[PDB]
Amino acid sequence: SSMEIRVRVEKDPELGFSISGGVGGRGNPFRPDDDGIFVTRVQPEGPASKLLQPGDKIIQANGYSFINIEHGQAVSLLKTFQNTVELIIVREV
Amino acid sequence: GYETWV
Numbered sequence: 001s002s003m004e005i006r007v008r009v010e011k012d013p014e015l016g017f018s019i020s021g022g023v024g025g026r027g028n029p030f031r032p033d034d035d036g037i038f039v040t041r042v043q044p045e046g047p048a049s050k051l052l053q054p055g056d057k058i059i060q061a062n063g064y065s066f067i068n069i070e071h072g073q074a075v076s077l078l079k080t081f082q083n084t085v086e087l088i089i090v091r092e093v
Numbered sequence: 094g095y096e097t098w099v
Contacts (some may be wrong), residue, residue: 078099
């Protein structure tokens with residue numbers, strides 16, 4: 001059902017998706033009872049278009065856990081990597 | 094914010 005998937009997104013020039021959630025992020029459109037970070041929109045031309053989909057829950061980025069992370073911390077981390085972000089996501093498959 | 098682009 002749920003699986004942990006690894007994808008690597010190349011910045012071009014950013015990752016090309018949006019996130020909602022996080023501790024203090026006011027929730028997410030998918031699992032309201034989950035504090036986690038969720039992919040919310042994916043740019044169709046962008047570097048994440050073949051890799052991520054709305055609803056994916058990011059649990060790790062370049063080795064950093066996204067479990068029990070604040071919205072702003074999650075955003076800043078993703079933005080501060082210059083070139084590539086290896087993500088572990090949880091997806092309903 | 095609710096939704097933030099990265």
